[PDB]
RNA sequence: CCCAUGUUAAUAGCUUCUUAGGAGAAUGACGUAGCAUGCUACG
RNA sequence: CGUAGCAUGCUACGUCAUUCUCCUAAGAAGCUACCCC
């Protein structure tokens, strides 16, 4: 394993091999056999100790890693999953989903959960002339990949207005976040 | 002619008369006698062919409910039953008879015209309602109809019969109380009228008509007047179920005993009921044979706890709910006042009062210190009432000052693996294989829309004739174990760092409370809970873990002054049952290194002709009534006949009961009452569960062997078990333990089981089980109806006929009959959906990081093995991708902890764990 | 625990623990913060010591790691290697570090004590990392200069209302004012605890404290006052968010005929619209401060938060905004200790309504629309980096003038800071040039604007205006006392008390004063309400009286005195003891 | 394999939810759970779609909480 | 272990060994000398291990015992925890109401299930939706365990307080229903 | 030679890792006994 | 030829060092049954 006993070793079993290449003889025999095993011995003490070391530092590499890793990943946790959110719904490529997403890019959010059931409600802001153009025409609201019936466009102010006041040149005379409230058709 | 016998059956209480059947011949019917002979032994449906009943109708010729039986029999019956009516005459629970000799064709018979009997005797009521099966149900509905119950539109519903889904069935059968009620009074006056005029004769079920009156005095022999005996034992213990599913004393709480009277008002202070529940007894049941003691406390063994526990779990829906649990009374210590509950009160054993209460006590140690602060005492009496209209069950306070609510937030998800499972071909459409097993959430109001489950848990008043004997049975398969309270220091903790009750986990673990104590006031503890009852909050939380449905998990944490007794009592024996290999009771049997296969060819311990079949209770521990549990504590703890006295072996039965049975659970932040099943979270309830599963399988066996029709059973042995089989149920005070061994032995010969408290796999005798002489299903169906009080539909029950496939679904692991090395096996193996589903769904946001789990993708590729034995392809493919998930993992942990560090792991040894060697290892019978 | 370098953000495990701040570093860059300056301690996840029994080298040029241990040469592995080595220091992440240029800043910014001028210029001009590393560094060196301070005990206590001092020899005295609070503790052999925090306000007579405090315990002999720093919390968000034109007014909905007045500022609130970020520059008293409110008024549907650094500051922009806002939809927020008083009028504490006013260390973690900082002179790179992490907005702007005083910048004893070098904004606008530039002087009287014109501006401010003849100065010289580095001025409150009912129309004449010391004494001799000049920022009073309360190099500074002077409406009178500044500008004699 | 990747996005985006603190609104954590529940169940994929929308239109309708403008542009 | 005086004897008889090599000494004096040596070494080894046993020993003991020292410490805080919160609980009685029921009871023994149907002075209702709190608590003082209870306080299942007025079948559903109403009793 | 600030039970089975103990086996060093052999001396 | 002294080889026991196996205990992490299908 490349340190000093292992030196010893290495020598002393050399010369042990020239013993064997030898091997005609009884007491120098037998004495460089005997210091052949105890170099050998003294040698594998240190390969112990070494080897313990090296498995004892190795429940402090594992335990460190799963350590930092841990505390890396539970503490980047609220960014993470809201990365992964959008990955996956990038991934998906549903009409409805996307369309949503393409519209809460641009002001234009719902300002209660979407429904259901045909003939419910759904209050949803529109940010400019621009969205309002896209999404409405004339009565119809396309939202969400469906069409909704315009029940009231109430402006900044809560004051209602008429679909007839919202043209291009009358636009910018408005307080523009118009809560448009729809019914699902 | 069939005219002048019609014009003298009318006699002289004119009434208009059709005749059922025809032409002054016998009608014959299929009714539901209870009889017992030299031939014939049972309570079972036979066809009655001696009596041309006839029927009368009223003005307007509308034929009401009242028949004219004209029984006719030898002349010896006759002139004997004539002296017998004519001593029985004047009390008003007998029938009006009338004594004719009518010329039929060419000799005179003699006729014994009963008259104005209903059409359904009693035991054709108690019958239908025990051995109930949902296709054949006529005499039923035919009762139910009849009695104004339900207006014939009720049976066009879905599940019009079932307890758990259509709760407003009880209201129907809570119409027959007044019907049943009198009944019962009625058998007292005939019972009086008997013992008054000297009559010794047996009391059958089937000899009252369902208005109250009797008929019947054939084999009535009659002795000296004023001495008279009539035998009850089998006419109470068959009406015993019926007791409490049609809740026939409920006229007992109007006060003088009326229903149009209003409700009567006990006084709120008023525990000690026993002079009540006596005269209950002395006006019901007044001529039962054996004795009754009020509070339990009193009885001799445990057998005659089941008794009067079973008699109380009747007498006690009478007395105010408000009335039960613990009995507070005002101590001082140091001269400072608490309120401490020196006992119990239980609607099961009556009054329990404690013998080591300490008024004017200075100091407290640490026993009396958790003592104090176990008990829901202070607690309740300490915080403001509580009215929740969520739950239909009590609300006994509500400790903080706002109700809290607890969600389930949603599991995470293993983005990585899902993307490697959908790279493998996975999660296709049209798959074999696809997610199933998600992680639910949940509402706020979940935890206390779950503790509402409790609602189905009726009091029901088991049988106790036959209980007192399927007990015996039980404890026969519980023999081959050895048990005994053990001293505190050889109590074995499996995990310590788990919460502790309500009141205790305010502080710390278990491992606090089991550190903190030493061994002598650990074992002081344990010998305070044999001489007096420590109440027991127990908190109810809801369990965040993959599921199916998405019905909330709710478990039971019960206080550590609970589990830390229970340990102590119930360890030996509970460390016998888990390391005996070869029982009815196989928990501790490792399904790895082939004992699955060894569970499976220790089932079919030499049955005759063998099919598997497995039932499912549902509900099981929210709708197991209090005797059962009562029962199964009882036969756990028959094993001290040694090591602990009798009243030593009360109170821990009462504490049993208190801390686990009937608790108060805090649901919430609020105490509420909790009616009875039980709760899993205590040290026996694998166990207790176990015993009550086995309870009902032999309970269903008896029934079924009873039941049949008696001489159409031609191996003339088995006869002879059904007429000893009655004898030793109903005829018969003191055990018979000959032939108790001899019926185990018949079940285990014929009905050889598997029991994993209540996952049950039976290899029943397809012959016998057919002929009737083993509970098949329908049996099941029927005990649990009565018993149990649920309906187990049976779609959720299987039976397999071949054995080369194994039992469908055991511990919710398959079987399959797989070739290895060179013999056949049994590989169980899992969903192959949920292993899926518990790999892409982690329960905690670490076990998404992939490469620090390794040593959970290798427990779960363990578990998912048998798969790749698999006939179908996309189950075998689950392991490959779990196999090739695990080196993608090591590859890419590999990676980065080169990266981090700079020397890769020297002594590495995670390239075994992606080789199926591995995991063949672990099934094969070596280790 | 691994984290970011700071000069080149690579992942690293190693802290140059010898800095202040104990700042992540990578590999070769700790290898070059370690062979150049002096600094010789590299903690990693465990700290370079020499884990003998006994030895203490902790130099990361020497120590060699042997087994699972660093130990020095005395005790040395046979088997080992040297850390500092092969041009790197061995830590996590040994082979994907790459090294900056920047190791030169990090060692001129670490090393440094701040109290050289070229600090200052050399910890505003560097990459973003190092302004953020460099205002952190200089934070914690305030902050531990606070532990070189005095501890206070009690002899005999005076009455409940008034307590006597004891300070302990040897430490130098903590002046008496708002900011440094006490805690009290009694180490009389037991209860090594905290009881309580207070506050001193030294009294007229002798040397003794009403002391105030968040409670009324009484004070016994073993009790006694100590100070202590909260913490400095790492700050992460960039000074400046990156800028980026838009093409059209995006996130800002404006309103039809928004009033008469702000009818020339519409240009300007399009621009601040147009862009992210914005930077108005003008002298003082020029619509800066009402410029923002009348944006809000502009932009009605869009939730503002208005911050400033100081609490004067924002309490000014609160006043004229309620003056020109709804109440309805307004707000304040104060901290919960609250040393000073503040503008208990809207309906304070309330995050979620639409105008929240606050200061630039009590502001909550939230959104907004547009968030105006305003006196972005009296701000450091901390004030900008928190304002940009704890909130985020659509449109920020940054409103002040850079010829103003600046922060007070304690830890500064030698050399004057360049305008452009206060902080990040500063550069900003006196480099590459303000975004919006207002200048008529819409407050002061022309006399003293006038003269302002001339000493701190190049003769090119204007204002619509005439001579008030109100505009006073009153040659004098003064008693100097030097108490607590809190200066006080016999003579000068007896001055203005004797030529106070002369004039019984200046009643309302605010104080001025450059020390707190000076400002709180004399609320007992004239009554008058008072503030102090750092504070004087934001707010306007009808008369005023400036005190050049002792001649030091403070008071001297010209940008103190001017802003000073510019907050008069109709009255001024100035009593000036500096020769020159009594004939520097241009009143009447007096 | 479109179906059973609306029962995953949905387990992420109501673990999103949870984590923007919307737990402590019960009528919203109501219908969010709800909503949750009924799309792991439905077994046909235009009724977990229209569940889907459903549920995404919490997250978006709390105006500041995420960051949409940032998060989608990263196409 | 090199403190025992076997390992001064090993390192003395290496010595001689050494010196017997530097100086070249003959065979009788060798073997002599690797003999002692021998003996000594392996005195000092068995030595050796004996001290690594007792020092083990001597370690186990200390962490025994500093582990109970911790144990015996945590029972005593839980103790002081355990009678802080019965002393508290005891304080909060309504201790007049209580003695006199108690006190009206035959031998002192009272259900626990009245013990705050008639001593309680707060009570808390859990009302689920609009028809239960039509029929259990309209007005403002209803009825509940014969006794008049007045209503203080009506606060929704978000822990945000309802003024009356607010619950109206054409307001019902813009709430969060589980409704607790805090009354006391009067 | 001084002035701004604080937002989640019981039971059971199994896998992996660590420590301690015991036993066994293998090798080596050493010590003490017993057996055989070789040399010198006295008798 | 016995004995004494020294030396060489061989068997039994004991101390120590190393490796391997098995077991027994304690501790930590994880999975499944449990839960509703
Ligand atoms: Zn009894
Ligand atoms: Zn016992
Ligand atoms: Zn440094
Ligand atoms: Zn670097
Ligand atoms: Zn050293």
């Keep these: ?185 | 002619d069939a005219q002048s016998f019609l014009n003298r059956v009318c006699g002289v209480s004119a009434a208009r008369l059709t005749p059922c059947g025809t032409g002054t011949s016998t009608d014959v019917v299929y009714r539901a006698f209870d009889i017992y002979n030299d031939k014939v032994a049972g309570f079972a449906k036979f066809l009655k062919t001696n009596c041309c009943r006839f029927q009368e109708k009223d003005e307007d010729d509308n034929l009401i409910d009242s028949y004219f039986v004209v029984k006719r029999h030898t002349f010896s019956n006759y002139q004997h039953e004539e002296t017998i009516y004519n001593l029985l005459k004047d009390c008003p629970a007998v029938a009006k008879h009338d004594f004719f000799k009518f010329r039929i064709d060419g000799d005179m018979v003699p006729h014994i015209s009963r008259q104005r009997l209903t059409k359904y005797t009693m035991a054709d009521l108690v019958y239908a309602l025990r051995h109930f099966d949902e296709g054949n149900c006529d005499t039923l509905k035919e009762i139910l109809v009849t009695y104004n119950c339900c207006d014939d539109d009720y049976f066009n519903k879905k599940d019009w019969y079932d307890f758990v889904e259509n709760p407003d069935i009880l209201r129907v059968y809570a119409n027959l109380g007044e019907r049943v009620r009198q009944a019962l009074l009625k058998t007292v006056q005939f019972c009086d009228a008997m013992r008054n005029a000297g009559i010794v004769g047996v009391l059958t079920l089937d000899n009252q008509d369902l208005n109250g009156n009797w008929y019947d005095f054939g084999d009535f022999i009659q002795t000296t007047p004023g001495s008279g005996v009539p035998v009850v034992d089998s006419y109470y213990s068959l009406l015993m179920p019926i007791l409490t599913l049609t809740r026939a004393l409920t006229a007992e709480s109007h006060v003088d005993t009326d229903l149009t009277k209003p409700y009567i008002k006990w006084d709120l202070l008023k525990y000690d009921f026993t002079e009540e529940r006596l005269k209950l007894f002395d006006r019901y049941f007044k001529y039962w044979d054996q004795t009754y003691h009020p509070n339990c406390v009193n009885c001799l063994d445990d057998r005659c706890i089941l008794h009067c526990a079973n008699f109380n779990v009747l007498f006690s829906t009478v007395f105010p709910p408000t009335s039960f649990g613990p009995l507070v009374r005002k101590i001082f210590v140091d001269g400072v006042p608490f309120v401490v509950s020196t006992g119990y009160h239980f609607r099961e054993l009556g009054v329990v009062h404690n013998q080591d209460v300490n008024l004017h006590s200075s100091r407290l140690s640490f026993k009396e210190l958790l003592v104090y602060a176990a008990d829901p005492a202070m607690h309740a009496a300490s915080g403001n009432l509580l009215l929740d209209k969520r739950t239909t069950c009590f609300s006994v306070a509500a400790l903080t000052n706002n109700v809290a609510f607890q969600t389930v937030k949603p599991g995470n998800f293993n983005k990585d693996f899902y993307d490697f499972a959908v790279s493998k071909g996975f999660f296709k459409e049209g798959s074999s294989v696809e997610l199933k097993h998600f992680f639910f959430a949940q509402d706020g109001n979940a935890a206390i829309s779950d503790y509402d489950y409790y609602r189905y848990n009726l009091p029901t008043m088991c049988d106790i004739r036959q209980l007192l004997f399927v007990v015996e049975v039980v404890d026969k398969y519980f023999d081959c174990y050895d048990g005994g309270c053990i001293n505190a220091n050889q109590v074995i903790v499996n995990n310590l760092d788990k919460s502790a009750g309500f009141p205790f986990n305010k502080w710390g673990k278990a491992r606090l409370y089991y550190d903190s104590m030493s061994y002598e006031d650990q074992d002081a503890l344990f010998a305070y809970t044999k001489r007096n009852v420590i109440p027991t909050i127990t908190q109810m939380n809801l369990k965040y873990a993959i599921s199916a449905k998405n019905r909330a998990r709710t478990v039971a944490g019960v206080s550590i002054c609970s589990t830390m007794t229970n340990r102590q009592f119930h360890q030996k024996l509970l460390k016998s049952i888990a390391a005996t290999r070869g029982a009815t009771v196989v928990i501790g049997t490792s399904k790895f290194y082939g004992g699955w296969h060894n569970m499976l060819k220790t089932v079919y311990s030499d049955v005759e002709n063998p099919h598997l079949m497995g039932w499912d209770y549902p509900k099981c521990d929210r709708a197991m009534p209090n005797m059962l549990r009562i029962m199964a504590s009882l036969v756990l703890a028959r094993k001290h006949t040694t090591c602990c006295s009798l009243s030593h072996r009360f109170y821990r039965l009462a504490n049993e009961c208190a801390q686990v049975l009937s608790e108060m659970v805090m649901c919430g932040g609020s105490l509420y009452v909790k009616p009875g099943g039980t709760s899993s979270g205590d040290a026996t309830t694998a166990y207790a569960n176990s015993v009550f599963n086995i309870c009902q399988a032999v309970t269903a066996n008896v029934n079924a062997l009873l039941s049949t029709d008696g001489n159409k059973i031609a191996d003339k042995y088995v006869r002879n078990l059904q007429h000893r089989l009655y004898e030793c149920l109903y005829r018969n005070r003191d055990v018979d333990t000959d032939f108790v061994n001899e019926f185990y032995a018949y079940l285990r010969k014929h009905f050889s089981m598997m029991i994993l408290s209540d996952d049950a796999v039976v290899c029943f005798n397809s012959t016998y089980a057919s002929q009737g002489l083993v509970a098949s299903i329908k049996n099941f169906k029927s005990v649990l109806y009565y018993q149990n009080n649920v309906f187990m539909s049976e779609a959720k029950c299987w039976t397999e006929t071949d054995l080369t496939k194994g039992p469908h679904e055991f511990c919710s692991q398959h079987t399959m009959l797989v070739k290895q090395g060179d013999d056949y096996v049994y590989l169980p193996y899992p969903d192959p959906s949920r292993i899926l589903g518990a790999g892409c769904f982690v329960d905690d946001i670490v076990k998404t990081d992939g490469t620090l789990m390794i040593e959970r993708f290798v427990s779960l590729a363990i578990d998912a093995y048998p798969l790749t034995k698999h006939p179908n392809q996309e189950y075998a493919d689950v392991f490959h991708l779990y196999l090739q998930y695990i080196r993608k993992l090591h590859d890419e942990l590999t990676g980065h902890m080169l990266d981090m560090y700079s020397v890769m792991l020297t002594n590495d040894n995670t390239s075994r764990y992606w080789e199926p060697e591995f995991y063949e290892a672990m099934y094969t019978p070596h280790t | 625990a691994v984290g970011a370098c700071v000069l080149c953000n690579s992942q690293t495990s190693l802290r140059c623990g010898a800095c202040i701040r104990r700042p992540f570093l990578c590999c070769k860059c700790c290898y070059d913060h370690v062979i150049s300056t002096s600094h010789k301690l590299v903690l990693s996840v465990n700290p370079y010591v020499c884990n003998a029994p006994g030895c203490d080298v902790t130099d990361v040029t020497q120590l060699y790691l042997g087994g699972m241990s660093y130990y020095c040469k005395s005790h040395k592995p046979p088997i080992s290697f040297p850390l500092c080595a092969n041009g790197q220091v061995f830590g996590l992440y040994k082979n994907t570090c790459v090294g900056s240029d920047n190791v030169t800043d990090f060692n001129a910014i670490a090393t440094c004590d701040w109290t050289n001028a070229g600090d200052y210029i050399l910890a505003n001009t560097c990459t973003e990392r190092l302004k953020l590393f460099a205002a952190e560094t200089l934070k914690a060196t305030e902050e531990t200069f606070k532990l070189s301070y005095g501890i206070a005990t009690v002899r005999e206590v005076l009455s409940d209302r008034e307590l006597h001092l004891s300070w302990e020899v040897g430490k130098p005295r903590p002046p008496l004012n708002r900011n440094y609070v006490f805690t009290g503790y009694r180490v009389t052999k037991n209860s090594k605890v905290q009881i309580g925090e207070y506050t001193f306000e030294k009294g007229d007579y002798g040397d003794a404290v009403v002391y105030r405090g968040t409670t009324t315990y009484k004070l016994n002999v073993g009790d006694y006052f100590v100070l202590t720093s909260h913490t400095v919390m790492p700050l992460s968000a960039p000074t400046l968010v990156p800028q980026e034109h838009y093409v059209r007014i995006t996130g800002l909905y404006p309103t039809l005929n928004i009033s008469d007045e702000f009818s020339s500022n519409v240009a300007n609130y399009q621009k601040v619209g147009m862009q992210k970020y914005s930077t108005l520059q003008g002298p003082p008293g020029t619509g800066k401060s009402h410029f923002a409110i009348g944006l809000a008024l502009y932009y009605p549907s869009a939730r503002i938060v208005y911050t400033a650094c100081s609490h004067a500051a924002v309490d000014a922009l609160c006043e004229k905004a309620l003056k020109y806002l709804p109440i309805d939809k307004c707000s304040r927020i104060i901290p919960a200790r609250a040393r000073v008083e503040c503008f208990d009028k809207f309906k304070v504490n309330s995050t979620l309504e639409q105008y929240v006013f606050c200061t630039v260390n009590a502001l909550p973690e939230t959104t907004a629309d547009i968030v105006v900082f305003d006196e972005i002179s009296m701000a450091t790179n901390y004030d900008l980096s928190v304002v940009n992490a704890r909130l985020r907005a659509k449109h920020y702007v940054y409103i002040g003038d850079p010829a103003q005083l600046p922060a007070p910048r304690t830890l500064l004893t030698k050399g004057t800071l360049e305008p452009e070098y206060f902080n990040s904004v500063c550069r900003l606008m006196k480099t590459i040039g303000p975004d919006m530039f207002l200048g008529t002087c819409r407050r002061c009287p022309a006399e003293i604007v006038d003269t302002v014109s001339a000493l701190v501006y190049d003769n090119k401010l204007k204002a619509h205006k005439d001579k008030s003849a109100q505009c006073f100065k009153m040659f004098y010289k003064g008693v100097i006392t030097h108490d607590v580095s809190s200066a006080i001025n016999r003579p000068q409150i007896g001055v203005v008390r004797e030529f106070l009912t002369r004039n019984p129309a200046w009643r309302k004449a605010v104080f001025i004063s450059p020390y707190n010391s000076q400002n709180a004494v004399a609320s007992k001799i004239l009554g008058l309400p008072t503030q102090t000049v750092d504070s004087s920022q934001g707010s306007e009073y009808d008369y005023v009286i400036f005190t050049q309360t002792t001649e030091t190099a403070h008071s001297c500074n010209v940008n103190r005195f001017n802003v000073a002077i510019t907050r008069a409406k109709v009255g001024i009178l100035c009593i000036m003891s500096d020769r020159d500044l009594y004939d520097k500008l241009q009143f009447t004699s007096l | 394999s479109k179906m059973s990747d609306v029962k995953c996005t949905s387990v992420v985006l109501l673990s999103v939810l949870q984590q923007l603190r919307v737990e402590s609104s019960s009528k919203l954590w109501a219908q969010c759970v709800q909503l949750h529940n009924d799309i792991l169940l439905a077994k046909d994929t235009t009724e977990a779609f229209e569940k889907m929308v459903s549920l995404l239109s919490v997250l978006l309708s709390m105006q500041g909480a995420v960051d949409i403008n940032k998060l989608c542009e990263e196409m």
């Design chain 1, 1 to 185: 394993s490349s340190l000093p006993s292992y030196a010893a070793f290495a020598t002393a079993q050399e010369a042990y091999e020239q013993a064997v290449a030898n091997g005609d003889s009884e007491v120098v025999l037998k004495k460089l056999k005997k210091s052949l095993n105890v170099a050998k011995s003294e040698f594998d003490r240190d390969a112990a100790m070494q080897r313990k070391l090296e498995k004892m530092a190795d429940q402090a590499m594992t335990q460190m890693y799963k350590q930092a890793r841990s505390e890396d990943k539970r503490a980047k946790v609220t960014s993470a999953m809201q990365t992964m959110l959008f990955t996956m719904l990038r991934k998906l490529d549903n009409d409805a989903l996307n369309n949503i997403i393409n519209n809460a890019r641009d002001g234009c959010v719902p300002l209660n959960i979407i429904p259901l059931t045909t003939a419910a409600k759904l209050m949803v802001v529109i940010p400019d002339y621009n969205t309002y153009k896209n999404t409405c025409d004339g009565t119809t609201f396309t939202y969400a990949s469906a069409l909704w019936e315009i029940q009231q466009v109430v402006d900044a102010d809560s004051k209602i207005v008429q679909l007839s006041e919202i043209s291009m040149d009358n636009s910018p005379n408005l307080a523009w976040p118009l809560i448009v409230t729809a019914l699902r058709a």
